[PDB]
């Protein structure tokens, strides 16, 4: 789904079809470089998504003092310290699932059990 660029000239490649050999050949519209396509996938709309509650993590989230602190442990390092905080996505139907990030194992883990 990514947008490849011509390695000779950093420009947006377009799909264009072979006339007889029946293969998608990503030909550069700037220069004459051409490349065959790995998959027949071209375009993808994705009218439904549910993604974005997790990321935005820096390696020193816990360096900020404003996050609360708890005593549930990380289930890799068993250290009782932790930093917990809710979703990073904000829609009107995002969940009250929680995200728990530790300093020792430096790992992200949740509290869902379905």
């Amino acid at each position: 789904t990514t947008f490849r660029f011509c390695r000779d000239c950093n420009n947006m490649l377009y799909p264009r079809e072979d006339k007889e050999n029946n293969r998608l050949l990503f030909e550069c519209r700037t220069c004459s470089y051409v490349e065959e396509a790995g998959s027949p996938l071209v375009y993808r709309h994705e009218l439904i998504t549910n993604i974005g509650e997790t990321a935005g993590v820096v390696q020193d989230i816990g360096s900020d003092p404003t996050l609360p602190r708890s005593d549930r442990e990380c289930p890799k390092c068993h250290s009782r310290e932790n930093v917990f905080f809710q979703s990073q996505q904000r829609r009107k139907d995002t969940s009250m699932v929680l995200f728990f990030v530790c300093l020792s194992c430096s790992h992200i883990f949740t509290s869902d059990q379905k």
């Binding site: 799909p15 079809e17 006339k19 029946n22 293969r23 998608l24 396509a37 027949p40 996938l41 071209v42 375009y43 993808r44 709309h45 009218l47 439904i48």
Partner: protein, 307 residues
């Protein structure tokens, strides 16, 4: 009497509150139509022969509510399939002989996938919607679809005509997503069921609070909603009194309008005598049509120049 009525109806407007639009702006919109609603809610009662049949209620809601492809579309991908009669995708291969037991077409495959749950919640099977997208063109779209019982419901379609594929096919994709109705009547939205009750005469000759099932909505139409089966055509009712006027008649219109205004001003600070409210309603309807009391509305009439 009209002056006294006006002052009486004017007094409790100062004690008002501010879901469903209520309060002062709702009162202003009702009194000052404004061919515009902000709340297209309409109430529907079932056939009395179906008292408490939840499957019947959801069959009715599936019958009445409009949906699109986008209501059921999740996976909408595009493909280059060179062989017209053999799939490069290894999953779709049995469907070839399912539909194969009319060649001059582009080797470009558009492919759609839906939700099983969002398909049969409204009680439609994928066969007839494949039929529907087949029949809406029949000339340009060679259309292939799977069985219902497969793990992933798929649609395979191609453009048939005896370079220049991508943007045409993208626009045709956008068109079929945005336009093709499925069932129901458009300008009607999500519908939900309340378990209302109704005071009903007892067979032994008394009254009893008896439950029944109702339909509420977020869209407005009248010319089609009594047409569908299993519906009481009589006891239907809508807040949007202009449409009741237009479909039914002006007497029913003034009755509905009085009902609506009574509900709004009796939400709080009730009450007043019926005669004042009735006088107001009937004098603002007594011209053969609705008339808001504006600078332009009642004033542009055969009426004395000084008033």
């Amino acid at each position: 009497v009209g002056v006294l009525a006006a002052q009486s109806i004017g007094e409790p407007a100062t004690q008002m509150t501010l879901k469903v639009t209520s309060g002062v702006p709702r009162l202003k919109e009702i009194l000052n139509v404004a061919k515009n609603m902000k709340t297209p809610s309409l109430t529907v009662y079932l056939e009395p022969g179906h008292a408490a049949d939840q499957e019947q209620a959801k069959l009715i809601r599936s019958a009445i509510e409009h949906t699109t492809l986008k209501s059921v579309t999740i996976a909408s991908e595009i493909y280059y399939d060179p062989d017209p009669r053999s799939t490069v995708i290894p999953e779709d291969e049995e469907i070839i002989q399912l539909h194969f037991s009319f060649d001059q077409q582009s080797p470009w495959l558009l492919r759609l996938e839906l939700d099983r749950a969002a398909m049969n919640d409204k009680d439609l099977t994928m066969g007839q919607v494949g039929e529907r997208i087949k029949q809406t063109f029949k000339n340009d779209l060679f259309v292939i679809w799977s069985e219902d019982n497969d793990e992933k419901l798929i649609i395979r379609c191609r453009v048939v005509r005896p370079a220049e594929e991508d943007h045409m096919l993208k626009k045709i994709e956008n068109t079929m997503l945005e336009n093709i109705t499925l069932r129901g009547v458009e300008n009607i939205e999500r519908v939900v069921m309340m378990k209302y009750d109704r005071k009903v005469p007892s067979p032994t000759g008394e009254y009893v609070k008896e439950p029944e099932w109702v339909l509420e909505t977020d869209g407005v139409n009248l010319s089609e909603v009594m047409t569908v089966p299993g519906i009481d055509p009589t006891r239907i009712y809508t807040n949007s009194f202009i449409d009741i006027m237009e479909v039914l008649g002006i007497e029913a219109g003034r009755a509905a309008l009085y009902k609506e205004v009574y509900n709004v001003i009796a939400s709080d600070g009730s009450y007043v005598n019926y005669r004042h409210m009735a006088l107001l309603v009937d004098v603002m309807t007594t011209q053969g049509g609705l008339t808001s009391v504006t600078r332009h509305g009642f004033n542009r009439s055969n009426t004395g120049a000084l008033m």
